[PDB]
Design a protein around this ligand. Sequence first.
Ligand SMILES: [Mg+2]
Ligand SMILES: [Mg+2]
Ligand SMILES: [Mg+2]
Ligand SMILES: [Mg+2]
Ligand SMILES: [Mg+2]
Ligand SMILES: [Mg+2]
Ligand SMILES: [Mg+2]
Ligand SMILES: [Mg+2]
Ligand SMILES: [Mg+2]
Ligand SMILES: [Mg+2]
Lengths: 98, 199, 138, 109, 108
Amino acid sequence: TFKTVFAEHISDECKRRFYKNWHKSKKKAFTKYCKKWQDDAGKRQLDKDFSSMKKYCQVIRVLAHTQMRLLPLRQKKAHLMEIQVNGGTVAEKLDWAR
Amino acid sequence: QVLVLDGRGHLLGRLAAIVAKQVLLGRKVVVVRCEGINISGNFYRNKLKYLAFLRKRMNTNPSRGPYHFRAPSRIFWRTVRGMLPHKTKRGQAALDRLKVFDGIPPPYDKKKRMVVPAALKVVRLKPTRKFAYLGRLAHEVGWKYQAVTATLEEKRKEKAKIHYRKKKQLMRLRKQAEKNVEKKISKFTDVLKTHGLLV
Amino acid sequence: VFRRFVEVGRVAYVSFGPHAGKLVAIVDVIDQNRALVDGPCTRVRRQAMPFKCMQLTDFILKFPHSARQKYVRKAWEKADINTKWAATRWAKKIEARERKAKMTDFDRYKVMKAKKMRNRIIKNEVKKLQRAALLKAS
Amino acid sequence: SGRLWCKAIFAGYKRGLRNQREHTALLKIEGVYARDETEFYLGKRCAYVYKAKNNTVTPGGKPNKTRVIWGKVTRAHGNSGMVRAKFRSNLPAKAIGHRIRVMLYPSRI
Amino acid sequence: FLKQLSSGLLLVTGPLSLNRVPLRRTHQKFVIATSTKIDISGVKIPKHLTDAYFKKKKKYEITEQRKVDQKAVDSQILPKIKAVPQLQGYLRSVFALTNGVYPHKLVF
RNA sequence: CGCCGGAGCCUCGGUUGGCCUCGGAUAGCCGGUCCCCCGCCGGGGUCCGGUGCGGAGAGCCCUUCGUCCCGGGAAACGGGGCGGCCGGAAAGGGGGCCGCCCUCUCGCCCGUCACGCACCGCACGUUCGUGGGGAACCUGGCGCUAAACCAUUCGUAGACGAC
RNA sequence: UGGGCCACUUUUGGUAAGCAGAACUGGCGCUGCGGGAUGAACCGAACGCCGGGUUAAGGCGCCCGAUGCCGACGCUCAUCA
RNA sequence: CGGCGGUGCGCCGCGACCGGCUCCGGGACGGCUGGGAAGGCCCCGGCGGGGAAGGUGGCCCGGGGGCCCCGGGUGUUACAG
Ligand SMILES: [Mg+2]
Ligand SMILES: [Mg+2]
Ligand SMILES: [Mg+2]
Ligand SMILES: [Mg+2]
Ligand SMILES: [Mg+2]
Ligand SMILES: [Mg+2]
Ligand SMILES: [Mg+2]
Ligand SMILES: [Mg+2]
Ligand SMILES: [Mg+2]
Ligand SMILES: [Mg+2]
């Protein structure tokens, strides 16, 4: 794995995945990471990361999770997986993904 | 202090014996480009030797039997291990101070590589005799990173070519400089030529 | 393509063995791996000598394939092989190596002190040339 | 203000294939690779330097952690440049493949 | 090197202005003789200095007798080694072993 | 509790200058030139040089007693200590460059002048090294206030754990 | 003690046997040691406790002491050497 | 902080000479043989008489050239032996 970039906003559905006990936690996951998007230097660094991924990587896999609030199941913790992106050049794969 | 040897053009067993002896003596040895190691005898013979080794297996539970590594670096490492007394603390320490790689990783891409003329194919084998390439042998036995290493190696080769051209220009410039300042530096060129450091 | 050949008359340099560092001439070829050599003006008797301990030079002097000591000697003196070999860069490198081996401690200190300044000056002028090339290329 | 001792490696003990004689040690000095080339080092005294837990007295200084077992190069060994060394205490087996200092001062030049 | 004493110990001088080695005794075995000589035959060493002089007596203080003896000998010896170029610098430097330098291969 | 920023203690050992890089052929190689030919400087053509490799790992680089006077030689564009520009992903580079605020004519090579515990013949001396690891002494600055397991629940699980 | 066994050459029965039976000498049994990877009888050599030297049989790519000789002359390619 | 005669050193070390035993190195001298064999120098030692090719010049043919080199033919020292 070369680099991992997350979205600015991640729903509590996916946040539940990161905790073994969501009832006793403070829900602090990504609370300090989310600030990389709203700051000028942070988003400049993010664009630098995207440029590095564009110029170095070979296969691009996108992270997506199911919406479990639309289901009759008891559990509310979303299932997060990696789905590979197949297509043209790495640059346009990354552009489509972003 | 670390002995770095370029494996391209070397014979497997003869290089391994010297590596094992040096490592027992106490040097830290890194063997690089293990896909370029040669073995005497034709490819079909060598691959049947390795296929018989592959057939060797523990009947009761194969997961506990011999481990048949497919990487050329691991093949060389296992040969050295067989030449070492690896069932003792001394042999294990020797194996620890030995390090073996495939291709040329970039701690060592920028360092000069040594060769061992006692274990070179062109010196030890008659030109009419046949030989085999360890990279091809490993690929046909099950190694899965032959092309990746080739592309990375051609990248390294292009970068090294650029560096070598720059160095050639630089030291040609140095020779021009010495020709320029020979009038001033004659007082030392003569005392070096009278002791054999020059020409 | 080859440039040096083992024929009758070519002089050769003895790399190792008893008569190492001396020049011999091929007088006759005995077999695949043995030759008859003779140094008349360089302290080598007529004897069989293997090809493995010799290495040819770019000098050929003419005598019959079974000539005698006097005739080989006169051909050698006519050709002036001693002076030509002394002029040769091969012998220059040989004697430079000998002199460097013979160098002593005081000579080592002298050479160290001299090459310190020689490298310093050459490095400074190299920097000057780099600056000139950079300014003319920018 | 530099090194005044040559570098040697304690290769092993005097031995056959199945018997070990601990009172004699085998040494590789660097740069010497011939029996006729080992002649310089006969009679030179050699030392093994190691460190321990607590201090010991030192000649001309305050006590420190260093300790030394002294020896002497006796005669050559084989054809490849080995020599035989005899130490006033048999070298510990943990010193296999470690540095042994070979001095110069018992000189006869 | 100056002379050998009656006890077999070499009498070494050393120039104080060069390498801070005073009139001292040394052992013939623990030295290396380089192939560099000084035309010292035209130098007179005072007779009174001997093994009895140089032997340890019993904090050490340098006596005026030692200082004046050293002054005489060193003033006699300095000009003769100033006549050899770079010799003062060679004497002032310190011998040491570096990488790849093998004692059995180098002519001392 | 985390990063930047003082003496020390204990303990674990080794070590006693660096080499910063073409790719390769071996019945053949290496370095320049370009009057010439295509291509984004490279490949080739030509020619001239080396090849028991000297643009040689049989090699190269650094080469450490120190300080104090004057002279020569070398430098003058040099030596050291701030902001920008580039240098890298196979197991990411502490390298170069540009402007910089200041300073020295001191660094290197030849000479002149003396001096330092000259410790009285003697051993592990001389580094890498503010080394790795563990406790506390400590002056400040910039910062932050989690999660796992148990207990309970579930049954997509289950001998018990586990999930 | 009165169960023996093994080996060079000789030798009887048996197709043969690590079979069964004899002659000569030497061994193992009663015996450690260096070499033959490993082994009762094979090769060398027999033993108080040690230091230096040198050997036997066998060896000197590495395990593993020793050729890290600029060793000599040839033969041999084996997809079962 | 006495000279001698004898005993030893609190611990760690060093040197020198003597003798014994070993492993090497550097010199120089002489004997024997086919009273060494070959070989060196004295115009191939000189004087004559022969031999042949692993045939030198010479001559003949051809080619690669620009007088030299190369292959074959003949032959008996000539400009090698
Ligand atoms: Mg230390
Ligand atoms: Mg009974
Ligand atoms: Mg029977
Ligand atoms: Mg019994
Ligand atoms: Mg008995
Ligand atoms: Mg027995
Ligand atoms: Mg066997
Ligand atoms: Mg027998
Ligand atoms: Mg013994
Ligand atoms: Mg063996």
